[PDB]
């Protein structure tokens, strides 16, 4: 939704300096969206 992607370092220095914390945030987000309830519609974009 935004023009460019900001790398891990920029996100860390903006929100919370910790680098591995961003890694844990992404891990938890992936874990949540892998929960079968939320992903149901996205499966329809399965073949691509």
Taking the least distance from each CB to DNA, the nearer of 30 and 42 is: 30
Q: Please, what is the minimum distance in Å from the beta carbon of residue 27 to DNA?
A: 8
Residue-by-residue DSSP string for 1-48? --SS---HHHHHHHT-S-HHHHHHHHHHHHHHHTSTTTTTTGGGG---
Pair of tokens at residue 16: 């919370």
Restricted to residues 1-48, the positions that interact with DNA (CB under 7 A) are: 7-9, 16-21, 23-24, 26, 28
Binding site for DNA (CB under 7 A): 7-9, 16-21, 23-24, 26, 28
């Amino acid at each position: 939704d935004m023009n460019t992607d900001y790398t891990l370092e920029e996100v860390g220095k903006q929100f919370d300096v910790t680098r591995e914390r961003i890694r844990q945030i992404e891990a938890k987000a992936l874990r949540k969206l892998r929960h079968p309830s939320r992903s149901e519609v996205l499966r329809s974009f399965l073949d691509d």
